[PDB]
Amino acid sequence: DRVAQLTIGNSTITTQEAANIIVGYGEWPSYCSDDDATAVDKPTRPDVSVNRFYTLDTKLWEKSSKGWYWKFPDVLTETGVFGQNAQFHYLYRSGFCIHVQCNASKFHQGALLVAILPEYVIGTVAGGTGTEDSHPPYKQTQPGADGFELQHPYVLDAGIPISQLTVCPHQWINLRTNNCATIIVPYMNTLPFDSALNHCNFGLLVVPISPLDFDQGATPVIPITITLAPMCSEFAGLRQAVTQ
Amino acid sequence: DRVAQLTIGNSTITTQEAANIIVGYGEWPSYCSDDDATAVDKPTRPDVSVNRFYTLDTKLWEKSSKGWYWKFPDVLTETGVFGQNAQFHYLYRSGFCIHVQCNASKFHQGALLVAILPEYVIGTVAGGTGTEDSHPPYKQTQPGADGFELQHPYVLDAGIPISQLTVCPHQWINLRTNNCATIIVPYMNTLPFDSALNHCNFGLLVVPISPLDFDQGATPVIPITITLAPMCSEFAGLRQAVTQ
Amino acid sequence: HSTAETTLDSFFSRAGLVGEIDLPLEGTTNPNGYANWDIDITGYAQMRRKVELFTYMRFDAEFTFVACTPTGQVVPQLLQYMFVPPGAPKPESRESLAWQTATNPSVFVKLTDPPAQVSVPFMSPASAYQWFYDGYPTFGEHKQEKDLEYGACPNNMMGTFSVRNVGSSKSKYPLVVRIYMRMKHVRAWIPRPMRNQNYLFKANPNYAGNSIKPTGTSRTAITTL
Amino acid sequence: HSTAETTLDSFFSRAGLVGEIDLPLEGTTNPNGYANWDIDITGYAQMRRKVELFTYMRFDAEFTFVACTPTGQVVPQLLQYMFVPPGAPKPESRESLAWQTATNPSVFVKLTDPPAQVSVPFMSPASAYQWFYDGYPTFGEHKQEKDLEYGACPNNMMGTFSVRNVGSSKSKYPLVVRIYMRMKHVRAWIPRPMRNQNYLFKANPNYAGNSIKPTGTSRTAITTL
Amino acid sequence: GFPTEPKPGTNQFLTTDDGVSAPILPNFHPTPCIHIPGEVRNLLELCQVETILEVNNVPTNATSLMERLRFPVSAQAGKGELCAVFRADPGRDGPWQSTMLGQLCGYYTQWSGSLEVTFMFTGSFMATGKMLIAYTPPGGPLPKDRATAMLGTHVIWDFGLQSSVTLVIPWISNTHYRAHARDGVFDYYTTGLVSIWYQTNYVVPIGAPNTAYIIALAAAQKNFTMKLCKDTSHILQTASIQ
Amino acid sequence: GFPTEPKPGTNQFLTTDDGVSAPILPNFHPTPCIHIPGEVRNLLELCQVETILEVNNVPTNATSLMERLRFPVSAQAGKGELCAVFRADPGRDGPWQSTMLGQLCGYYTQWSGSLEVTFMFTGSFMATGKMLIAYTPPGGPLPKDRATAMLGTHVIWDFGLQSSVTLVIPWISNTHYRAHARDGVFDYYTTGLVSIWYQTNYVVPIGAPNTAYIIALAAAQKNFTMKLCKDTSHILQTASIQ
Amino acid sequence: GFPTEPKPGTNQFLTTDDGVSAPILPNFHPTPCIHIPGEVRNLLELCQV
């Protein structure tokens, strides 16, 4: 139960210090029913070429880090064959298998909260005073694969408490216990299909709740890598490639 | 299916470039039920002497023609034994088999829309400005066998779009495909019988949607002939002959 | 996806304005405390355009009468509505003897009561009403002077609707009666092209010949949006 | 101990204020005897905070309209409420032609009658309403000037609610219409953290950055009550 | 009497309320209903009947109105030239406004389903040619050339004995229903674009016309549906109707 | 008509009355309901999900808000020193206000059932230690020392591979339900007190941090129930929301 | 009481409306009907004379 292997497509992930697997809302990704669908054109289900593990950028965990987030359909729109299909097709649909990995040693300590927040809408500080109706820039609402850093993690940059973020599919990475978190997310939206460009079904939040710490001499560079794989990907409404 | 023969009475029509047969509103002409009738006198059903093909005047299709129309009970009221019965009797009832014929060559081109418009009420241009409540003359509402030419085909001289005239039993004569149109119309009215003089159950419209064209040298005279036969004719309420 | 909202009843069973009667204190329009409205739903464009989508129509209807002053003010006044079928005596005054309604159906309401509502059957001698009648109602010569009768079908002329102040003296307030109609148990035959131009008159499809506008919007070029 | 009072219906099926419309005699706020309220239950904190506990919600509702003057006085006045779905013509005046309601649903009531009440279905083109939409409604470049559209989901924009004095002259009294909503047959998905800071605007979760208060009460020391 | 308690909505007159009303004529019996041809049961029956699509909605002249009903095709230079273009949106201002489908749509807020457009070639028997009718789903800008248009849903049409060809505009949407598309925000519900290109060329012998016309007829498929009644965008009346 | 007789309550508008109301749209049919993940049926489903309990509700500084989410533990002098303390009352001002349970409680006048608090040690792998979490039922004043705290319900927690431990605050009440406890008279409904003590000591080798933190997560048990809906004590709004 | 909602037509007096009306004489019983010759059931009986 502490060891596990995730194989999908032509990619395999290994781990010897896992903490089980979470299946968001107790549901596995699935394809769209014939009665839940509307688009009449036959969709493309590329399978193995898009349903595989993509490893996005690595972040560095510092004793003062606040946390980061990634919007999901988004992080992959410019990567591999998944990205190509997401650009050529109007409609997209899929679940995800997210595997956040971060290892240290038996002498390091700290705890990361890895959670999935559906429809993660970002807010602004409203000019500090709260009298200015400002809005988050494109660079912040859809940060891409590089993710974005939280400025006010306590309120998740959206006026909501992070202490309650656990009502969402989550898992923790407690260095003294495990070195990775695995969460499987089904397609969640009020529509059977939607644009992979304009809409971000959910956001991945990785936030340090218990600060990283260690004594001088132990390796100081502790990376946090994000690996994710689409599941049951379906695309429809073919046309030319659109970036945004 | 491209060839056909229509025999009724002592008349026969032949064609080797037809486009099937249309049966208006999916119903064949029939006689009046004993429960749909009111007039108590026994009707006359002359059969073969009136249910036959009558060939009315011929029109010339020009590269600039607008289109023509014929009101139906009317076109026949002064022809053959059908006309005599229509004049001597107050009440009349019957269906029709309309066969519009027009042939050219494999080098001519053009398309005629042949349609049946029930209760085809004619309107006027209202003095151009639309402030004068003028009305169409008898010569135009009931043109007889010579038919009448449309002044504003786009609106069918009645303020309605010709582009939607296809919701009525119709057929096209596309010179590169067929050289005739056959439409069978049942008796349509809100009464079981009616006057063949005062009321015109429907109108036959022949309108060029795609202009006639050909190169100089090919015969320039392209006629459009209208042949029609009453079906299941019934007359009642006998008296002296009335013209109008 | 359901196809229920496109049935004839779903489409037509919605009350709409078809009549409007004025009963002012001073003026030249029904200033004697009574009015005779010729029953014709062809006086208003919205309702008219819908029904004119079909040639023939058979249906029962629900008439609602909303009354008040020209400002929308509700006043304590008693009115009498009377249906006068063709042939019955039309009232010539507020105190006409015809208001005895020994046989005609009448409704007595106060403007303070909720709008009067009533059910009407299909009362045509024909099997259906005709929004279009391509012919004349009588025989004989059809001269210029009588072209007024072209397209006039008596099977659609259901009579008159009369209103009055239930009294023998002038009313203290100016009134207005709006008539709404809701069709029920609808049957319809032979669809036609939908009205293209503005309506000008009731008994006919006349259009302004100098202002013949296209069915819709236009653009600069056929190759550009 | 029963768990019935914590079902979604028990929790949400309680009418609460969601709208308030003013129809004064003199002023700069709807002084012409009519008003157009954009249907949005996000204008009042109590009702808003509850529904924002969930991300998506599907439900039918019961709207009640309580009308009276600014002093709470009941006056003999006749009003007309009209639901104008998106696309329908919004009235531009008290005598607008749109008040004919040939198709839109309307309610005519006197302030002396008990508050009008009506049932509304789930009318979104989506399978549920979204209190939160993390995205834009249209494609293209998203410049500073158009950031106004972020988080705006048309599937939640149900139209307008219009009110007027049923008349052609100025009303004799100043009016106020309070709109209450009671949810029925409720389905809800994906719970979220409950509003932490004061609300400032309707179409968004903006908060005063200089007045970020703690979720709750505070104390001197962690080792003392 | 029986204890009652009137609720809000009392006395209101809801235009679309389907209730009972007192009958004005007791024991009245309507004229029997004869059998009449062409009875309609559902409006969708009409949405499936093809009516002329005004693709050539350019001429506004008084004498040139009849030519919006058909567009030209003729001998070209052989470089896959563009013939015509138009939005596939049914309830939007444009070519579809001339069709019965477009008109009935005006009465409903939302629609769903595949559409179809039949093109009839009215040239001469001796005229030959191949066209490429393409349908570009949402997001795809108006294809600049044939090589771009052919990447979407399309059909190569060959002129012959069978005068017409049908381009089916399959229902390819993100939402189950589409509200009417307009410029701006509601362009979210756009259906896409249709464009006719010359696959080869309009070829003809000596003695036959160098220009022929095509007539487009449009309607809906069997899976087409509409919902939420509303009034058409236009009211054909300016002043009171006399 | 049928004899009726209206009673008191006529015309009143009761906010919570569940009656029938006239429908505004006849024959209207809602958009089909697709399947959506995470559907909630009862709020008690949420009261059982653990959310971070702000035991260290001391820092109010702008930059120090994130540290209320965890409290420190470190090498001591070995005399059973006190670590932290807090009231077990769910719907009372204090640490529980940061939890989902505490927030949902705000919407109900009364509650009943056992509560649970899970403590997660986020020190290093080399750090060891044993703590004593004690729950003191009503009447018991804040225990002055460990020898007094251990006389109530408690659990000795040993740090190890299993990072967390759960302190169950059993439902020990005189009444079947408890209304929210406040200072003064309503302190009658107090649940008690929780206090963490050092059973032994936080031990660590050379090279490992001398201070580590603990994160407390709280929720309700399966026997937890709430009744009598009311509005939360706070309204997040000062002026009109624009 | 039982929630009701009066519709248009309320209070109107329709001459031909066939409804119920309060009886003025409770338990009143009419004089028995003897047999009388020439009873008419339908006016069409007279149109044939």
Can you give a write-up of this model?
The structure is cut from a larger assembly and holds two copies of chain A (244 residues), two copies of chain C (225 residues) and three copies of chain E. Chain A is mainly β and 244 residues long. Chain A contains three helices and twelve strands; from the N terminus they run βββββααββαβββββ. Chain C has 225 residues and is mainly β. Chain C has a single domain, classed as Jelly Rolls (Sandwich), CATH 2.60.120. With 242 residues, chain E is mostly beta strands. In chain E, the strands form three sheets. In chain E, strands 3, 4, 7, 10 and 13 form a five-stranded antiparallel sheet that branches. Chain E has a four-stranded antiparallel sheet with strand order 5-12-8-9, with no helix packed on it. Chain E is built from three helices and 14 strands. Chain A binds chain E through residues 38-41, 90-91, 191-195, 236-240, 242, and chain E through 112-114, 136-141, 148, 151-153, 170-177, 223. The PDB classes it as virus/immune system.
Map the helices and strands.
This is part of a larger assembly, with 2 copies of chain A (244 residues), 2 copies of chain C (225 residues) and 3 copies of chain E.
Chain A: E1 4-8, E2 11-15, E3 22-23, E4 54-61, E5 68-71, H1 72-75, H2 80-88, E6 89-101, E7 109-118, H3 138-141, E8 148-149, E9 170-174, E10 180-185, E11 202-213, E12 222-238
Chain C: H1 8-12, E1 16-23, E2 34-38, H2 45-51, E3 54-68, E4 78-84, E5 106-110, E6 116-120, E7 129-130, E8 160-165, E9 175-191
Antiparallel strand pairs in C: 1-9, 2-8, 3-6, 3-7, 3-9, 4-5, 4-8
Chain E: E1 22-23, E2 39-40, H1 44-47, E3 51-53, E4 71-74, E5 82-87, H2 100-105, E6 108-112, E7 115-121, E8 130-136, H3 146-149, E9 153-158, E10 164-169, E11 178-179, E12 193-198, E13 211-220, E14 225-229
PDB class: virus/immune system
Keywords: pathogen, EV71
Entry title: Cryo-EM reconstruction of enterovirus 71 in complex with a neutralizing antibody E18
